[PDB]
Amino acid sequence: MDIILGIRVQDSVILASSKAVTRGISVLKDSDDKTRQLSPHTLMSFAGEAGDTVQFAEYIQANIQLYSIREDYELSPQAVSSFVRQELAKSIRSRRPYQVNVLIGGYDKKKNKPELYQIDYLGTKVELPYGAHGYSGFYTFSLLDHHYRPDMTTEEGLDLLKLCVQELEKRMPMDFKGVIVKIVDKDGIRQVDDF
Amino acid sequence: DRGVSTFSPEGRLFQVEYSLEAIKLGSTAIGIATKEGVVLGVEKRATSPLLESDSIEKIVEIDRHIGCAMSGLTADARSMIEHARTAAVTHNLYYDEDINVESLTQSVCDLALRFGELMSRPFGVALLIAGHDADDGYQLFHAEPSGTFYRYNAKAIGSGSEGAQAELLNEWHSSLTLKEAELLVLKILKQVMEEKLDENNAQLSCITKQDGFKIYDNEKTAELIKELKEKEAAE
Amino acid sequence: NNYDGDTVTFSPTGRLFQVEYALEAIKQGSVTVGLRSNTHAVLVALKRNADELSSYQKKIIKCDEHMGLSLAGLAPDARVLSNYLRQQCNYSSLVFNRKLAVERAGHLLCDKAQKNTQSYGGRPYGVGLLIIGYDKSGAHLLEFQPSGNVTELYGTAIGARSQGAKTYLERTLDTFIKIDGNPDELIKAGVEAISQSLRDESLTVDNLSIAIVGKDTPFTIYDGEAVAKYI
Amino acid sequence: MTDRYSFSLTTFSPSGKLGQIDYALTAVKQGVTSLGIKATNGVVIATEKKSSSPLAMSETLSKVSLLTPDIGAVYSGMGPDYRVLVDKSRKVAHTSYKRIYGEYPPTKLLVSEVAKIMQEATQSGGVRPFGVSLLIAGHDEFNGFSLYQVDPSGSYFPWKATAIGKGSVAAKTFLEKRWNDELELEDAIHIALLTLKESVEGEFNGDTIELAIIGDENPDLLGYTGIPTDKGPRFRKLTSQEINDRLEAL
Amino acid sequence: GYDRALSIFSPDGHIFQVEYALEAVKRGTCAVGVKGKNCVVLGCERRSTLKLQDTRITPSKVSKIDSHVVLSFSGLNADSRILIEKARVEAQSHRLTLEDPVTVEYLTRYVAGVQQRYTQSGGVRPFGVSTLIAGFDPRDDEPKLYQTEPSGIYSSWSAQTIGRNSKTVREFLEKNYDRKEPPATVEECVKLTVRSLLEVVQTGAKNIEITVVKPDSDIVALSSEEINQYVTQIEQEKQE
Amino acid sequence: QFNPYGDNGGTILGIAGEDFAVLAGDTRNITDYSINSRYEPKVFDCGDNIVMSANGFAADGDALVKRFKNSVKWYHFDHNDKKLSINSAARNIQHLLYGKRFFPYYVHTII
Amino acid sequence: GSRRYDSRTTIFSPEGRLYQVEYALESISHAGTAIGIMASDGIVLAAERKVTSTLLEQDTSTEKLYKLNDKIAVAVAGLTADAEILINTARIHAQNYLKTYNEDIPVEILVRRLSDIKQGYTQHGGLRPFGVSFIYAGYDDRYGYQLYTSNPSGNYTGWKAISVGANTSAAQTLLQMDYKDDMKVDDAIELALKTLSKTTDSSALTYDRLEFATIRKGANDGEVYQKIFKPQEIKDILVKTGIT
Amino acid sequence: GYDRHITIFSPEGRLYQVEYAFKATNQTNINSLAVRGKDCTVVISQKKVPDKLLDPTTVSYIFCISRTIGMVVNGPIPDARNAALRAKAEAAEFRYKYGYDMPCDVLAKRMANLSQIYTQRAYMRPLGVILTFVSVDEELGPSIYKTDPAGYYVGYKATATGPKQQEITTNLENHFKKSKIDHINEESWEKVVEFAITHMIDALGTEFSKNDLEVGVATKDKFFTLSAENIEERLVAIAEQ
Amino acid sequence: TGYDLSNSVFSPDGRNFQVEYAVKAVENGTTSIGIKCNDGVVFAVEKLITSKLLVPQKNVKIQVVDRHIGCVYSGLIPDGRHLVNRGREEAASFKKLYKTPIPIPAFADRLGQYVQAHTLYNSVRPFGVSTIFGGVDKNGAHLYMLEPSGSYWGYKGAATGKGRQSAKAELEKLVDHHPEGLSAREAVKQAAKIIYLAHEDNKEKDFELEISWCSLSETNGLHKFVKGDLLQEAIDFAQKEIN
Ligand SMILES: [Cl-]
Ligand SMILES: [Mg+2]
């Protein structure tokens, strides 16, 4: 875990998530996908304590999938984000809290608008044009403050994302073995294979 | 009404005796024990021709060395089998060995009387538990909802039980081969069954030390049925 | 009649019919005999089979190295009670490094059976037991009934036609009590006692079941070819 | 041991009747008459003090009970069932309201809580319904004065004026003739005493009649001074002397 | 807690509460399942004593348990929701631990186990519901159709019907369904299903529901006009 | 603060032959620099030709042996006087020990 | 023991019916009639109060019509006390959903859960079922305007127009006759009152014996308004349609 | 007719088990009486010891609940003792929780509320007893409060309980008509006990020896029972007047 | 009717028929007695010798509670044991909290409340025993008799079982003839006689006598069984009186 980014543009939400899984002085894997599809138009990336991350991601995934089957309907990104926030808000006062930070990128089909939510392990939710968790934000936020425009295309958003990854690869201490990039729009979720 | 765990004036538990009547309504199941193995056979009894008969699962594996056949309210047997399987595997985990067939049966029979006012009623199903262990060799047990189990050389349960048991009385001897026992189950099943016996409405199985518990294919049983008919016509 | 629906109800004459119906299950059970001298205590049990293809229902259960019983009635209830005895015998050993007295064994069974006769929902035990044992005060023989009543005896018998063996032992009392330091002769007396309860059937090799405990003899059960000596 | 009665003792009969509720209402019918009348500037509740024995001190037995400083209750039916309901009603006013909002509940909501308790005795395991009908009079800032009736079923209805118990049928007819929407509190007390005389048979005075009002705030009954917003209880029980004064000009 | 043993044996060896639950199933609207060569079709009756209904929002008779398995039923409607909910939860729980969706056999075995538990648990009555569970196992093109009932027994069927007048439609299917050659196409399977319901239903208007399930989570419900075309076609061939 | 463990010292040794096996152990019991007993046995015959010793903290060692001896007893009751094989005894003891994984028996056990 | 006195509320008849559910429905058939009519631009709820007394306070009274949230209301038919237990549960459930998802609860979801509660009382617990039938009238952004009913069995269904309580047979026939799909709210108001006026057991239908409510999008732009009619407003609407 | 076996309503709105519990009250065939003085409250009860083998000192239906409160029971002794033990526990707990001695009338209410529960809850039967509580309350003065199986309770100027209760009741009624006051206008408790015995003798029409009576007296800060000799001394005083 | 089918149900009389039915079971049982004496109490019981096969002196019916209380009962023997087991728990918790051994009157109420509790619910059965018990405490000697209803009183002499009326009559004579008091050693001898006299109502089977006693002087305030020479002496005294 470590680097998870998110950028909301005109017609889509783009999530970038590092591929490295490190334990001790060994990079155990360099192709790890730190994300789960909660519903056809909602994607959640995650980062934090080992084990907790996936266990939480999959638990949320199961619940949203259960809801979808029960009501034969897809929950809005806003609704999913609120559900996730509450689960974390419960967790923090538990015996052993989930130490997991997430980004929820979704496309609301009723509003025809992309939405990006940033939620930390405390259950602190914020809707943002761009978001990051961990040390990443200390570089990317200022970079995006400068280069981001609200009316950008998906292609422009990917170039803007490339600029972030380049900066992180230059100034971050750890080798995070690149990122997996996924786009969330009106047509659902797809992965960019060449990044 | 009246209590579930009530004794009759003759000194029997009403509910246990009534569950025995339910088992008499069930389909026939036969077991025969030999020195070469133990054979288990059942009547499938499909309620309609549209029902896919191969989905009727009345013979069941508990462990590699223990098999089980059922008769009566077969839905009730699911939790009994589950318990048997867990008991067998759990014993292997705790002791690094196979569990004795008698010990397994005893564990299943402990559930039987755990009912009252625990579950609400006794089981409505009887089990034939067949297996092998190193100590007492090939064994066949009849487990009832009374909590009682008897070892048998051969045993029939279900609707055609009393007629089949009398037939097993004459036919069984201590030097039966496995092949002889297979035919004997098929013979006796064909006698007590309503519909005509074939590979689709009857199922065979066995447990041997070497190969463990095996349910026979419909192709294999069909050849044993054909072998049986030829031998009866031959004299 | 109207007062036999459950164990919590007394009859107008002060009877507990469910307890009496449980007592009736014992009378249906196969005969078993108990007797002792001053050195040894012996259980002799007639085992019963479903048919010629079936095995013979095991009647005798070991509780500890120095104690055990024979049963007559519902076998699962005997398994529950014998298990309880095993635990109580074992508790006495682990905690106090003390072999459980046969008298206390009886007291514990009495109190366990009683609780089932005073509460709604439950039922009485449907089995009678004959407990033998050798403890610090010599050989013992107990008779347990599921009413709760436990009784210490020189000899007794329970089950179907148990009156025949019980009469014999009542005559033989003076003889068998002084069979000290001789196991085989005390068993012979027990085998002759149970024979008085036989009708049409006789004692065969896989029919008879004998158990013995004594001064220098742990509780051991004899079945199969080991009892051929006494036929 | 233990409560084995975990099943309903009140069930639907083939005709659709809930037997125990009907029978509870029959018990209420047998009970002594009580009534309530709503005025423009107050509410009055009244009942007869049926003495079990002349040696008994009827002052110690209070049929009209304060629930909150602005809410009072009276009943017809089984007294013991009423007494415990008053205990539970007083407590629920604190636990489910005052300890949360820092103020007393409005009449309608306290009534609602009492109704809930009585409904549960109609459905819960191993219990019979309460054998009483309550008349609850009260005041609150935003609803003003109000009067409610609560039946064994747990149903409650708001009334301008009504009566329950022994001679309720005749008493309700009497109240229909006399009641108007311009009644002052003193006029309602006068009518209450007239209505009650019809049902009472023996002695009719301040010692055999129990009567309380929900009217103006009573600073003299508050017990302390210094807080301007706290002006005292609107519930006041009329004294034996105060009743007799009005019985002369009857 | 309420402990009473409601489901108990009778002198003749019957559990009346389980058998009375079957009567509730017999009262329920007819439901039929027919599996073809490459598909399964679930047909369902809807009683026409209810006009002024709102079919948009009214609970549909066929329910999706997962994207690849469906469940229809006959009997008490309120009871069916409880089974469907439990099944749906177990479906997601199976995906979570095994990392693979349920097989139709497994899902059926679970639902049947729940029904059985309610026949020997204290304080509860059995489910007055029999179900038809149909679908396709993951990465498998062999059609699956299973039936469950209040007792807890379950089994696989080439074709089967449950509910009121089911014995009439079972009679129809028994002669019209060939084991050696099942309905080769979707059209053939739907037609045979509609035909079988037309023996019992009344009118082929808003009384018949049809749901077609195909491999790889391909489930679609037919509309009124689509079903009406089968009804119109069958009646014209009948007049002969 | 109360310390629930102690060290009773001693040492044990087991060797296996072709048709035999030995399990030896010194008879000294100690706490700190004092001797408690010069003859306190800690190698026991547990039945079914199994000898056992649990060396380290004697209170935990005696408890474990006691439990295993009791395990042998109940194995007989529950499985028709079957002899507990050495391999089966080993696996049983694993479970006894691991049952107290989060409050261990401070012993090195040999059978 | 106590077995002797157990009614066994959650069992099947030999015919496969639930005794207590059937008898609860028999109870509900004597309760005051409640009608729900769904129009294209709103929903009407109309209900007849049970034999009113002249000294009953009418304006500060609530017997038939209850508010569950800002978008959903119910009409009651049966035991009021039972209905209030279920209504508070429903009100809480709606707030739980809103707290969890930050969205108003879809009508069906609320209905299903309330119906599931009723179902439980018929299958386990040994308690009597709730002697209540609801008409749910509500709106959400998925299905728009919706009418549902639930009964003591825990079974619920959707409707264009429906009646519960007394004389449903006669009421349903009249609704089935005059109802059509392109109907407006003001027309549905008139239909609801006309149906009650003919099916009533009373001599004449008056304002004091009625509860009335509408759920329109008659607020300002793309938002729903609940209107629980006041006594004077029922008096006026009764004159306007020419019943009095 | 199972509505007569448990505490549920009959068609005419009655609880038969409660009514039958009232009849259990008189099973002992003992009459009790309670009156108030200026400074005291006196309670007296008949004492009948039929068996010669009984230890007469252990035969009692009067109980010392707390230091200040006394209680006499009309009904079978098992239920009487059940009620006594509970009342003792309640009075002790009250003092611990609220820091002052439980008043007579409050204990009566508490025991009455418990009795009420048995009339509503099915698994619990009512106690077949009538509990008469007496004290000299520090706020209300001399106090008599009585409880029954229905859960009813009320204060009394004076009271009587038992088979011949009505004869005793009217006897007392006529006295208070005559005296025109709520109590026995007497200084010492000795003479109030004498009044109680005198008016019981007149009402019942029987003469009493020292062993035929049982007396309890409540004064400020203590309730106590009288011995046989204390009663004998009291009987002598009546006879010599 | 049906008022007698369920425990804790009042009949129209105000009676609990189930308790009265339990009394019948007590009346069916063997005879047991209790005699209060100068500085203690004596207990005795009839043991019917059903068969020659019964081991003499080895079916003990009298039970001890704590170290100073003796209990004996007639009726359903198991029910009596259950009551004693409770008595022992009650006496143990009293001594645990209050240090001093439980007084007899205190102990009497503990059993009384427990037995009475078994008349409050239909889910339990009343006790099928009348229990005679007592001992020596700080206030001296106490004898009690407890019945199925929960009713108990203190006694000068007590008797219950099949021969209760015969024993009661004999007990009443002792109270009359010895107003100053009866000694402990005398009471043991008298107890033997009264059991032998009460055996006339159960004379088919012959019986075995069993006696126990608590006395401040003779047993030092502790409960002991009468055995050996003192037992045979009491048997001979009884044998001489019947002839
Ligand atoms: Cl209270
Ligand atoms: Mg009661």
Curated annotation (Swiss-Prot), chain A:
Molecular function in Gene Ontology: endopeptidase activator activity
Any Pfam family hit: Proteasome
Alphabetized UniProt keyword annotations: Acetylation, Cytoplasm, Nucleus, Phosphoprotein, Proteasome
Subcellular location, principal: cytoplasm
Keyword field contains DNA-binding: no
Record's subcellular location: Cytoplasm; Nucleus
Modified residues (N-acetylmethionine): 1
One GO term describing the cellular component: endoplasmic reticulum membrane
GO biological process terms on file: proteasomal ubiquitin-independent protein catabolic process; proteasome-mediated ubiquitin-dependent protein catabolic process
List of residues that carry Phosphoserine: 76
Record text on subunit structure and interactions: The 26S proteasome consists of a 20S proteasome core and two 19S regulatory subunits. The 20S proteasome core is composed of 28 subunits that are arranged in four stacked rings, resulting in a barrel-shaped structure. The two end rings are each formed by seven alpha subunits, and the two central rings are each formed by seven beta subunits. The catalytic chamber with the active sites is on the inside of the barrel.
Summary of the function given for this chain in its UniProt record: Non-catalytic component of the proteasome which degrades poly-ubiquitinated proteins in the cytoplasm and in the nucleus. It is essential for the regulated turnover of proteins and for the removal of misfolded proteins. The proteasome is a multicatalytic proteinase complex that is characterized by its ability to cleave peptides with Arg, Phe, Tyr, Leu, and Glu adjacent to the leaving group at neutral or slightly basic pH. It has an ATP-dependent proteolytic activity. This subunit has a chymotrypsin-like activity.
Gene: PRE1
Curated annotation (Swiss-Prot), chain D:
SUPFAM superfamilies documented for this protein: N-terminal nucleophile aminohydrolases (Ntn hydrolases) (SSF56235)
GO cellular component assignments: nucleus; proteasome complex; proteasome core complex, alpha-subunit complex; proteasome storage granule
An example Gene Ontology biological process: proteasomal ubiquitin-independent protein catabolic process
Gene this chain is encoded by: PRE8
Biological role stated in the UniProt entry: The proteasome degrades poly-ubiquitinated proteins in the cytoplasm and in the nucleus. It is essential for the regulated turnover of proteins and for the removal of misfolded proteins. The proteasome is a multicatalytic proteinase complex that is characterized by its ability to cleave peptides with Arg, Phe, Tyr, Leu, and Glu adjacent to the leaving group at neutral or slightly basic pH. It has an ATP-dependent proteolytic activity.
Pfam families for the chain: Proteasome, Proteasome_A_N
Protein name per its UniProtKB record: Proteasome subunit alpha type-2
Signal peptide start-end: none
Main localisation: cytoplasm
Binding partners and assembly: The 26S proteasome consists of a 20S proteasome core and two 19S regulatory subunits. The 20S proteasome core is composed of 28 subunits that are arranged in four stacked rings, resulting in a barrel-shaped structure. The two end rings are each formed by seven alpha subunits, and the two central rings are each formed by seven beta subunits. The catalytic chamber with the active sites is on the inside of the barrel.
Curated annotation (Swiss-Prot), chain F:
Localization annotation: Cytoplasm; Nucleus
Coiled-coil regions, chain positions: none
Parts of the chain that traverse the membrane: none
Purpose of the protein: Non-catalytic component of the proteasome which degrades poly-ubiquitinated proteins in the cytoplasm and in the nucleus. It is essential for the regulated turnover of proteins and for the removal of misfolded proteins. The proteasome is a multicatalytic proteinase complex that is characterized by its ability to cleave peptides with Arg, Phe, Tyr, Leu, and Glu adjacent to the leaving group at neutral or slightly basic pH. It has an ATP-dependent proteolytic activity.
Family note: Belongs to the peptidase T1B family.
Subunit organization: The 26S proteasome consists of a 20S proteasome core and two 19S regulatory subunits. The 20S proteasome core is composed of 28 subunits that are arranged in four stacked rings, resulting in a barrel-shaped structure. The two end rings are each formed by seven alpha subunits, and the two central rings are each formed by seven beta subunits. The catalytic chamber with the active sites is on the inside of the barrel.
Record protein name field: Proteasome subunit beta type-6
Organism, scientific name: Saccharomyces cerevisiae (strain ATCC 204508 / S288c) (Baker's yeast)
Gene label: PRE7
Positions spanned in the full protein: 20 to 130 of 241
UniProtKB/Swiss-Prot annotation, chain I:
Predominant location: cytoplasm
Domain of life: Eukaryota
Keyword Ligase: no
GO annotation terms (biological process): proteasomal ubiquitin-independent protein catabolic process; proteasome-mediated ubiquitin-dependent protein catabolic process
Subcellular localization(s) per the UniProt record: Cytoplasm; Nucleus
Record's comment on post-translational modification: The alpha and beta forms are probably products of the same gene with different post-translational modifications.
Note: Present with 12000 molecules/cell in log phase SD medium.
Role, per record: The proteasome degrades poly-ubiquitinated proteins in the cytoplasm and in the nucleus. It is essential for the regulated turnover of proteins and for the removal of misfolded proteins. The proteasome is a multicatalytic proteinase complex that is characterized by its ability to cleave peptides with Arg, Phe, Tyr, Leu, and Glu adjacent to the leaving group at neutral or slightly basic pH. It has an ATP-dependent proteolytic activity.
Name of the protein in its database record: Probable proteasome subunit alpha type-7
Native source organism of the sequence: Saccharomyces cerevisiae (strain ATCC 204508 / S288c)
